[PDB]
Amino acid sequence: CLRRLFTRWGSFCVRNPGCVIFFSLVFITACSSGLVFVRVTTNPVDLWSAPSSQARLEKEYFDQHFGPFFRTEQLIIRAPLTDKHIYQPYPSGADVPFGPPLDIQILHQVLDLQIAIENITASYDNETVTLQDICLAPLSPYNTNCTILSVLNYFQNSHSVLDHKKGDDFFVYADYHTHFLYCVRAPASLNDTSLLHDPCLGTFGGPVFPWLVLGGYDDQNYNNATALVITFPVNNYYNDTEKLQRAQAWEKEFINFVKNYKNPNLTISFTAERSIEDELNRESDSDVFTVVISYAIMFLYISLALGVDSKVSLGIAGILIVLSSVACSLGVFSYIGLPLTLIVIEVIPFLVLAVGVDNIFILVQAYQRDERLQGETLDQQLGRVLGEVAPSMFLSSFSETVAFFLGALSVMPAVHTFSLFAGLAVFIDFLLQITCFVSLLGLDIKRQEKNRLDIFCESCLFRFFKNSYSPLLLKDWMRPIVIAIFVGVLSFSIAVLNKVDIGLDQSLSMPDDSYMVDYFKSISQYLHAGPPVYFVLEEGHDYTSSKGQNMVCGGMGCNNDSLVQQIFNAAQLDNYTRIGFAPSSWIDDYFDWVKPQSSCCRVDNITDQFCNASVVDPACVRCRPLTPEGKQRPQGGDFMRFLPMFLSDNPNPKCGKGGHAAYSSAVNILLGHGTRVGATYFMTYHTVLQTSADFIDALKKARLIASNVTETMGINGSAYRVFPYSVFYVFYEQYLTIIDDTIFNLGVSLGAIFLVTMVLLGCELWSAVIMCATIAMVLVNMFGVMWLWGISLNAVSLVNLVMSCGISVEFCSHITRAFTVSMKGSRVERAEEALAHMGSSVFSGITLTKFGGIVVLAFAKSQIFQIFYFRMYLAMVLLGATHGLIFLPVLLSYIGPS
Ligand SMILES: *[C@@H]1O[C@H](CO)[C@@H](O[C@@H]2O[C@H](CO)[C@@H](O[C@H]3O[C@H](CO)[C@@H](O)[C@H](O)[C@@H]3O)[C@H](O)[C@H]2NC(C)=O)[C@H](O)[C@H]1NC(C)=O
Numbered sequence: 020c021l022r023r024l025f026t027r028w029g030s031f032c033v034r035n036p037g038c039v040i041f042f043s044l045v046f047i048t049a050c051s052s053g054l055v056f057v058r059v060t061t062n063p064v065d066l067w068s069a070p071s072s073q074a075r076l077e078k079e080y081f082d083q084h085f086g087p088f089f090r091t092e093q094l095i096i097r098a099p100l101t102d103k104h105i106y107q108p109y110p111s112g113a114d115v116p117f118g119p120p121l122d123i124q125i126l127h128q129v130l131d132l133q134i135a136i137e138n139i140t141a142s143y144d145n146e147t148v149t150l151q152d153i154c155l156a157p158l159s160p161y162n163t164n165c166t167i168l169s170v171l172n173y174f175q176n177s178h179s180v181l182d183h184k185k186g187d188d189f190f191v192y193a194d195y196h197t198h199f200l201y202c203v204r205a206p207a208s209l210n211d212t213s214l215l216h217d218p219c220l221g222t223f224g225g226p227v228f229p230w231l232v233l234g235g236y237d238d239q240n241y242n243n244a245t246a247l248v249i250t251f252p253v254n255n256y257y258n259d260t261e262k263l264q265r266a267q268a269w270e271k272e273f274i275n276f277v278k279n280y281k282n283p284n285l286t287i288s289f290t291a292e293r294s295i296e297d298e299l300n301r302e303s304d305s306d307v308f309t310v311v312i313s314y315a316i317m318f319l320y321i322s323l324a325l326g327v328d329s330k331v332s333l334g335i336a337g338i339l340i341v342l343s344s345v346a347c348s349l350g351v352f353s354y355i356g357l358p359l360t361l362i363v364i365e366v367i368p369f370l371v372l373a374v375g376v377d378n379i380f381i382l383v384q385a386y387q388r389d390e391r392l393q394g395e396t397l398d399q400q401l402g403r404v405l406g407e408v409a410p411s412m413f414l415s416s417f418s419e420t421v422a423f424f425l426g427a428l429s430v431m432p433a434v435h436t437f438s439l440f441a442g443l444a445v446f447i448d449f450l451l452q453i454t455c456f457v458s459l460l461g462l463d464i465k466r467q468e469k470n471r472l473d474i475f476c477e478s479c480l481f482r483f484f485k486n487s488y489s490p491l492l493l494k495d496w497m498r499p500i501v502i503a504i505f506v507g508v509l510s511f512s513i514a515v516l517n518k519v520d521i522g523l524d525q526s527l528s529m530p531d532d533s534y535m536v537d538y539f540k541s542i543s544q545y546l547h548a549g550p551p552v553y554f555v556l557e558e559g560h561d562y563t564s565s566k567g568q569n570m571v572c573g574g575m576g577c578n579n580d581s582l583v584q585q586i587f588n589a590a591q592l593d594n595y596t597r598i599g600f601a602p603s604s605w606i607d608d609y610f611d612w613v614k615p616q617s618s619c620c621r622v623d624n625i626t627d628q629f630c631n632a633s634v635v636d637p638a639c640v641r642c643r644p645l646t647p648e649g650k651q652r653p654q655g656g657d658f659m660r661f662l663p664m665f666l667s668d669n670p671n672p673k674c675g676k677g678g679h680a681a682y683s684s685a686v687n688i689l690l691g692h693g694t695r696v697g698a699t700y701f702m703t704y705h706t707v708l709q710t711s712a713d714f715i716d717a718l719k720k721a722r723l724i725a726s727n728v729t730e731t732m733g734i735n736g737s738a739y740r741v742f743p744y745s746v747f748y749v750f751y752e753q754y755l756t757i758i759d760d761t762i763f764n765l766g767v768s769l770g771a772i773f774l775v776t777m778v779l780l781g782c783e784l785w786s787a788v789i790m791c792a793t794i795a796m797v798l799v800n801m802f803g804v805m806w807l808w809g810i811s812l813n814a815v816s817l818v819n820l821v822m823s824c825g826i827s828v829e830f831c832s833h834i835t836r837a838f839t840v841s842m843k844g845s846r847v848e849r850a851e852e853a854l855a856h857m858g859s860s861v862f863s864g865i866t867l868t869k870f871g872g873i874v875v876l877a878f879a880k881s882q883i884f885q886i887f888y889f890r891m892y893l894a895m896v897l898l899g900a901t902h903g904l905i906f907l908p909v910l911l912s913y914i915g916p917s
């Protein structure tokens with residue numbers, strides 16, 4: 020029935036093209052104003068997760084816990100121009116070798132670099148900002164020393180303390196070797212056992228553990244460390260931009276300072292937590308010219324290869340109609356308020372250009388092959404061609420729009436934002452193609468009929484060769500061979516289906532030969548500990564009874580399966596349960612603080628005030644009596660009576676490290692009638708983690724210790740849990756269920772494609788099943804290609820897969836319709852008619868995107884662009900072409916109905 024409205028509409032547009040072009044331009048500039056209005060695009064690193072996800076919400080809770088995770092400005096450092104040197108102690112019999120950067124002079128130089136960074140000045144708001152302004156100092160205003168995890172903090176970042184040398188002027192009883200080999204064994208002691216009782220604490224960033232500062236060593240022999248680590252953590256507020264961009268300005272200042280540091284005895288490696296965003300922005304800028312020149316080639320082909328009489332202005336007009344559809348959909352979607360990811364900016368114009376050029380060429384070459392008959396007015400020729408061809412363009416474009424508009428049902432944000440734009444852009448494309456471009460075609464027909472230079476204003480060469488191609492490869496000679504080869508290759512891709520990869524390799528996602536590739540190679544080469552993991556026991560636990568404490572605490576007196584104990588046992592088998600070390604426990608150190616034996620806690624005679632551990636007043640008595648009931652862990656109120664005193668005491672040589680030092684932010688204290696210990700974390704670290712697989716494993720198993728511990732706890736219903744949080748849990752959680760999301764997405768596509776292209780084709784089941792079955796072949800073979808060229812299954816590749824099928828509809832759909840409706844007496848005859856009539860046009864929506872999908876590789880060296888976008892575009896152009904224009908005519912010659 021569509022042929023009546025299509026025909027009288029073609030005659031209407033041919034009649035009065037002014038109304039058509041004018042109105043359609045009111046539409047075009049109407050929607051395209053939202054492009055200039057909102058224009059908002061999203062680039063925050065939240066692009067790889069949907070809100071209200073598991074890891075996303077857990078990130079919220081940890082963002083009330085200790086707030087945001089700090090930004091890490093790190094330096095992996097080493098000395099190439101020094102050798103080992105051996106320490107022979109006096110006089111006890113043993114020997115300890117010392118690695119290359121363990122030489123004292125190299126340590127001195129590293130301290131010079133460290134002090135050079137310690138006062139680095141950046142200017143924000145025409146003001147002054149140092150590292151002291153942005154670093155996180157735990158203690159304030161007492162001891163605002165910046166947290167710096169370097170080995171030199173064993174000597175308090177001071178040369179005069181590094182050059183202690185107990186011993187007469189011949190023998191050495193204790194030098195830096197000794198203090199080092201004692202601190203890396205008890206790095207929270209304030210008194211060395213021998214050397215003038217030097218402290219192993221630091222300019223307090225904290226008790227410096229040797230995994231955060233030493234690398235390349237072996238097996239608890241820290242004395243052979245081949246590369247030191249200097250970690251400046253800096254506060255990283257998420258809900259504030261003044262302080263954030265302050266820290267970022269200082270970070271690029273740091274990056275430039277390290278890029279320009281002359282020291283022939285050192286080989287550095289560095290990273291500020293703004294390095295990856297800045298280096299990705301830098302990365303996707305070298306190949307923009309190459310994309311533009313690709314589009315230049317494609318537009319040129321569209322201008323010349325249509326049909327000094329040719330269709331140049333026509334091709335330019337169709338190009339502008341496609342771009343008007345793109346900017347129209349972008350305009351309306353920005354109007355309503357929609358972020359516009361870069362993936363969309365890359366995938367959308369290629370798609371809308373392929374579909375638009377396909378419909379354009381179908382219509383134009385549909386008129387060119389057509390011969391009028393006697394009294395044919397332009398209404399009754401171009402309305403006839405429009406009624407003859409428009410059902411195919413409408414079938415394809417409509418199935419595509421309904422399969423892309425339906426792709427945005429999933430939760431993955433990239434494919435969401437993409438598929439919306441895809442749907443509306445293809446629909447507006449078809450509308451500006453059936454309304455405006457028809458009245459644009461009749462006018463070039465008039466121009467060519469009046470004989471005025473078509474640049475200044477039978478069946479050509481290829482219809483011949485298609486007519487020669489069909490019978491040779493459609494005879495019963497070839498007819499089985501095609502099913503043989505395509506079913507065989509299909510089975511091959513089914514074989515390498517389960518053996519395909521997942522994730523983004525860190526070093527390849529960077530412009531090779533940046534300052535970041537060296538960092539990744541040298542953290543795989545040296546470092547011994549990954550990003551910290553915080554084990555959050557949510558608010559609501561007791562913490563104030565022997566039962567409640569035995570559920571949580573570790574070591575002596577507490578249960579076998581408590582939180583700390585389970586984290587520690589999992590730290591034993593660190594190469595499986597990705598968790599590296601024992602957990603920094605707040606309650607375990609609190610119990611070793613209020614000890615009546617260790618004089619760390621003393622309260623006044625009546626005033627009940629905490630007594631500074633260095634005080635001297637005979638009125639502070641025991642916080643807990645040494646009565647056998649007293650010399651015990653504080654159950655009940657006494658707990659809350661002394662916990663805030665612990666979370667205030669700063670390090671004292673007559674006591675420990677104090678609670679303010681490390682656990683002041685690790686323990687939330689809610690003053691609600693009258694004191695409680697809600698929402699506390701236990702911190703440890705995360706082994707290696709040098710590939711996407713490693714990250715996924717760490718996520719799985721850390722959450723496994725989570726649910727596992729929460730099981731061993733007496734949970735009243737499900738109130739609170741014990742979840743783990745690291746920096747990366749939000750980004751590598753898509754891969755936790757990408758396959759279920761792939762299967763679904765593509766699946767829904769092949770459903771929509773199946774529904775429309777079956778009801779649109781006269782409720783004919785077999786035409787659909789054959790067509791979208793061939794498209795399923797396209798996608799499975801596409802996964803085989805993914806295996807062969809080694810591309811991954813992330814959000815980008817999945818988006819390009821959905822779009823890949825949506826573009827395969829443009830190959831198989833037109834042929835399927837052209838065969839389904841025809842009155843030839845044979846299956847083979849209708850196959851030749853369909854393939855010759857439509858295949859000659861479809862192979863002009865192919866050659867342009869191939870000749871662009873060649874220059875795409877030509878000048879673009881970005882590994883992500885060359886491996887993902889180029890090889891996939893190529894894969895779906897060649898794969899789709901060969902599956903719609905080679906196999907499908909054979910499968911239809913076999914099972915195509917009559
Ligand atoms: C990394 O450091 C390890 C520190 O323990 C070290 O083991 C130690 O190796 C030295 C080698 O000089 C042994 O010193 C030995 O020197 C005399 C020289 O004749 C030998 O006869 C003896 O074996 C003597 O022990 C240390 O004794 C040894 N330390 C211990 C506790 O056994 C590793 O060899 C170092 N490895 C690397 C790759 O650097």
Ligand SMILES: *[C@@H]1O[C@H](CO)[C@@H](O[C@@H]2O[C@H](CO)[C@@H](O[C@H]3O[C@H](CO)[C@@H](O)[C@H](O)[C@@H]3O)[C@H](O)[C@H]2NC(C)=O)[C@H](O)[C@H]1NC(C)=O
Nearest residue numbers: 235236237238239240545546547590591592593594595707
């Ligand atoms: C998990 O893997 C770790 C490395 O991936 C591994 O450390 C490596 O293994 C041991 C240290 O335990 C050292 O191998 C050493 O074995 C004996 C002592 O048991 C000594 O003769 C030598 O020190 C020998 O080299 C490796 O040097 C060490 N590698 C590095 C880079 O430090 C862990 O031990 C593994 N943990 C478990 C629980 O298996």
Ligand SMILES: *[C@@H]1O[C@H](CO)[C@@H](O[C@@H]2O[C@H](CO)[C@@H](O)[C@H](O)[C@H]2NC(C)=O)[C@H](O)[C@H]1NC(C)=O
Nearest residue numbers: 161162163164165175176177178180221222223
């Ligand atoms: C925080 O660090 C500074 C230096 O970074 C410490 O200053 C040192 O003070 C003691 C004197 O009592 C000596 O080690 C040196 O005179 C200083 N060292 C340097 C490098 O200047 C300061 O004491 C630290 N603050 C606390 C509370 O420990």
Ligand SMILES: *[C@@H]1O[C@H](CO)[C@@H](O)[C@H](O)[C@H]1NC(C)=O
Nearest residue numbers: 134135136137138139140149
């Ligand atoms: C920064 O401070 C250090 C001492 O902490 C000093 O040696 C250096 O000259 C200072 N640099 C600038 C630019 O102020």
Ligand SMILES: *[C@@H]1O[C@H](CO)[C@@H](O)[C@H](O)[C@H]1NC(C)=O
Nearest residue numbers: 141142143144145146147148
């Ligand atoms: C900052 O302000 C001062 C005077 O207020 C001016 O002299 C200086 O040029 C400003 N800084 C920059 C970078 O323009």
Ligand SMILES: *[C@@H]1O[C@H](CO)[C@@H](O)[C@H](O)[C@H]1NC(C)=O
Nearest residue numbers: 209210211212215216217672
């Ligand atoms: C601990 O170190 C200090 C140095 O400040 C020293 O005075 C004190 O005697 C040391 N303690 C012991 C028990 O040696």
Ligand SMILES: *[C@@H]1O[C@H](CO)[C@@H](O)[C@H](O)[C@H]1NC(C)=O
Nearest residue numbers: 100101124128281282283284
């Ligand atoms: C390290 O380099 C400095 C200057 O670059 C030089 O004075 C010193 O001698 C060097 N030390 C070694 C061990 O090469």
Ligand SMILES: *[C@@H]1O[C@H](CO)[C@@H](O)[C@H](O)[C@H]1NC(C)=O
Nearest residue numbers: 578579580581584585588589
């Ligand atoms: C803790 O001890 C019990 C015996 O009381 C034992 O059965 C259980 O396996 C232990 N837990 C772990 C994690 O080994």
Ligand SMILES: *[C@@H]1O[C@H](CO)[C@@H](O)[C@H](O)[C@H]1NC(C)=O
Nearest residue numbers: 623624625636637638639640
């Ligand atoms: C502290 O108070 C008690 C009250 O029983 C008193 O006996 C004691 O003398 C007081 N402390 C001093 C140093 O006087």
Ligand SMILES: *[C@@H]1O[C@H](CO)[C@@H](O)[C@H](O)[C@H]1NC(C)=O
Nearest residue numbers: 161630631632633634668669
């Ligand atoms: C006790 O400690 C605080 C800070 O730790 C310090 O300011 C105070 O002076 C100390 N007590 C005395 C009596 O000095």
Ligand SMILES: *[C@@H]1O[C@H](CO)[C@@H](O)[C@H](O)[C@H]1NC(C)=O
Nearest residue numbers: 580585588726727728730731
């Ligand atoms: C959790 O794993 C531990 C092994 O460490 C075991 O004691 C406990 O039974 C597990 N929880 C459940 C619900 O199986």
